[PDB]
Amino acid sequence: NNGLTPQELEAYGISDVHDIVYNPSYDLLYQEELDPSLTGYERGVLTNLGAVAVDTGIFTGRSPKDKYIVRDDTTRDTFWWADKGKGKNDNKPLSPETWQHLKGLVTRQLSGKRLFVVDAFCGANPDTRLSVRFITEVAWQAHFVKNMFIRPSDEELAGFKPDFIVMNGAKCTNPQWKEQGLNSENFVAFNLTERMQLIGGTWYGGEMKKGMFSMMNYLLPLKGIASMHCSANVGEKGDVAVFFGLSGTGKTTLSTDPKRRLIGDDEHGWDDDGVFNFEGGCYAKTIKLSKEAEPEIYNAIRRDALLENVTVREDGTIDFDDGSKTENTRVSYPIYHIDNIVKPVSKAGHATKVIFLTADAFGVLPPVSRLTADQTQYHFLSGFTAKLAGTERGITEPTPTFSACFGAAFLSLHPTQYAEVLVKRMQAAGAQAYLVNTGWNGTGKRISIKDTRAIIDAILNGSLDNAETFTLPMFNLAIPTELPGVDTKILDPRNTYASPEQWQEKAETLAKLFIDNFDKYTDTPAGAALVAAGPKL
Ligand SMILES: Nc1ncnc2c1ncn2[C@@H]1O[C@H](COP(=O)(O)OP(=O)(O)OP(=O)(O)O)[C@@H](O)[C@H]1O
Ligand SMILES: [Ca+2]
Ligand SMILES: [Mg+2]
């Protein structure tokens, strides 16, 4: 039906496939999205910036409650199941039977129509990458995966064999859900024996992106390769830095620095050769976006970029400040929309700087701290930050949260498994870790992007490592006495309070939350020993 034969899709259970649009160019996608006869959520609008904008419907973020993984002989003893030992997680078990029902709904839905099939790679390295095949009936969805995943060359497509198949049946729902013990009529299901992901009900593109990240998070650590929820860049001297963090904490904004070559902004692996990007694009947040503060991200918004849920006025101009649809407004663009990037392949050497970004809503943690090896493990496992996004934050949150490894929602294995491989990679490279508060302090306002950038610079240029430091009580974090380019006043979180006693109060409350959260890791001699690295009242 074009590139692919209708019979190859029949193997997946899809029938009467009328027309196949295989690996569409950006030009065909542009034409497809602007088709005047499109209706509903398939419709695209042209903005004054040249980029097309879409409305993802009801779902403006991920639906963790609708995430299920089939429990069978492949995943039984390896997955970090939500219903097993100590472990707050979204890995809810699903029966092969219910899975077959869901598959029937999606294949029936995709049957008898024109489909968009995009073949792409997840992982920059040939040896550990997943060849993924995406099937959708909605043009902008194909566009999303074209932007986010690694676009294969013509010769690569020649002998392309899918390792994983993602079927997006956003238009259908499961009416038998109550009867089947599911959360709702929507679903994001994974089956590792069949190597497939099914999406129903939710149009949100993030589900495909994070779904494959969840799969990489399962496969890579099993072979000794770290799978990380971080941004990464390289300086001209070949020095690599990785920035860990949750939604909206600064991974994207802080890694996009003109003096450094961007490797990626969200998901990376770490093998014997170094750090590699899993993706071929960036997924930036756009609420309150200002070209003055984020010129590189602003300029990447042009033809081929795909805006999501932003408010477009009558004259086609965008209102980036408007969060009435959702505060989780986004834009995806192929990585090349950023000028200073690593190419042709998104990879670099071993990371020597590991930065943990935390958006502290309590206004307790210092702007920056140099972590000891034990504190590194402790804070990585604790993953304290704020859920300021992921479905609509920046006003409906920040919700204080402890997200193991700074990405609990995408972990398929136990948090300790990610911690050990990461610690292994850091040791071999002599990497140092730092904790950075991109959140709030005593002023009730977020730390300015300018002060944060100066801090990142200080870390990257080593001025932080050679600065005199003193210990912050309770948390026992080593903070610099002064830093070039940064206002000395903010370095000590107690100073932003009219009384350090006010700080004491909040700091004791936060410390208790940390101690409470960590107790679930004290089971092993290791976890038990790490308690000494955490807060002490
Ligand atoms: N000091 C600061 N440092 C970083 N980001 C800041 C700061 N002050 C405000 N922000 C805002 O916080 C948000 C951080 O978003 P960013 O896209 O970097 O999050 P992320 O870590 O990449 O999240 P995700 O995992 O969802 O991609 C941006 O909207 C940015 O403008
Ligand atoms: Ca992310
Ligand atoms: Mg991002």
Q: Tell how far CA 319 is from the center of its chain.
A: 25
Q: Of 104, 140, 135, which Cα lies nearest the Cα of 120?
A: 135
- Please enumerate in sequence order all residues whose Cβ is within 8 A of that of 307, keeping only pairs 6 or more positions apart, or say none: 47, 51, 52, 53, 54, 286, 301, 318, 329, 330, 331
CB of 282 shorter than 6 A to ligand 1:
no
> Which position among 239, 257, 265, 266 bears the catalytic label?
266
Active site residue 251: yes
Active site residue 227: no
Phi, psi of 401 (to 5 degrees): -150, 155
Q: Which residue stretches of 149-284 are H helix?
A: 154-158, 177-180, 206-219, 251-255
Whether the link from the prior residue into 473 is cis, omega within 30° of 0, is no
CB of 452 shorter than 6 A to ligand 1:
yes
Alpha carbon of 23 to ligand 2 centroid (Å): 25
Q: 3-state SS of the chain: helix, strand, coil percent to 5?
A: 30, 25, 45
- Please enumerate in sequence order all residues whose Cβ is within 8 A of that of 160, keeping only pairs 6 or more positions apart, or say none: 119, 131, 152
CB of 438 shorter than 6 A to ligand 1:
yes
- Please enumerate in sequence order all residues whose Cβ is within 8 A of that of 57, keeping only pairs 6 or more positions apart, or say none: 41, 202, 203, 204
Q: Tell how far CA 378 is from the center of its chain.
A: 21
Active site residue 62: yes
| β-bridge pairing 92-94 and 114-122 | unpaired
Gap between the Cα atoms of 378 and 477, Å rounded: 12
Q: Of 24, 204, 237, which Cα lies nearest the Cα of 114?
A: 24
Q: What is the DSSP letter of 71?
A: -
- Please enumerate in sequence order all residues whose Cβ is within 8 A of that of 466, keeping only pairs 6 or more positions apart, or say none: none
Gap between the Cα atoms of 203 and 531, Å rounded: 42
Active site residue 252: yes
In degrees, to the nearest 5, what angle opens at C-alpha 320 toward C-alphas 316 and 322?
Answer: 100
Burial 324-351 (b: 16+ CB within 10 A, else e): eebbbbbbbbbbebbeebbeeebbbebb
- Please enumerate in sequence order all residues whose Cβ is within 8 A of that of 456, keeping only pairs 6 or more positions apart, or say none: 254, 257, 355, 436
Note the resolution in Å, 1 decimal. Answer: 1.8
Q: Which ligand 1 atom is at minimum distance from the Cα of 246?
A: 25
- Please enumerate in sequence order all residues whose Cβ is within 8 A of that of 113, keeping only pairs 6 or more positions apart, or say none: 17, 18, 137
Type of residue found at 16: D
Active site residue 290: no
Alpha carbon of 126 to ligand 3 centroid (Å): 24
Gap between the Cα atoms of 286 and 332, Å rounded: 10
Phi, psi of 263 (to 5 degrees): -95, -45
Residue 144, H or E segment = helix 139-148
277 forms beta bridges with: 268
Phi, psi of 245 (to 5 degrees): 165, 160
How many Å is the Cα radius of gyration of the chain?
A: 23
Residue 477, H or E segment = strand 477-480
Q: What is the DSSP letter of 454?
A: H
Residues 164, 155: contact at Cβ < 8 Å?
no
Residue recorded with tokens 């809503």 = 361
Q: What is the DSSP letter of 442?
A: T
Q: Is 88 helix (H, G, I), strand (E, B) or coil?
A: coil
Distance, first Cα to last Cα, the chain: 68
Q: Of 265, 281, 184, which Cα lies nearest the Cα of 230?
A: 265
Gap between the Cα atoms of 182 and 18, Å rounded: 33
429 vs 270, 339, 456, CA distance in Å? 11, 29, 20
369 vs 90, 179, 281, 470, CA distance in Å? 31, 51, 31, 10
Q: Flag whether 84 is marked binding.
A: no
Gap between the Cα atoms of 78 and 87, Å rounded: 14
> Which position among 133, 151, 251, 261 bears the catalytic label?
251
Gap between the Cα atoms of 502 and 391, Å rounded: 33
Domains present along the chain, CATH in parentheses: 3-39+65-224 (3.40.449.10), 40-60+281-338 (2.170.8.10), 225-280+341-535 (3.90.228.20)
Residues 306, 140: contact at Cβ < 8 Å?
yes
| β-bridge pairing 318-319 and 311-312 | antiparallel
- Please enumerate in sequence order all residues whose Cβ is within 8 A of that of 407, keeping only pairs 6 or more positions apart, or say none: 229, 246, 383
Q: What is the DSSP letter of 491?
A: G
Q: Is 181 helix (H, G, I), strand (E, B) or coil?
A: coil
Residues 33, 143: contact at Cβ < 8 Å?
yes
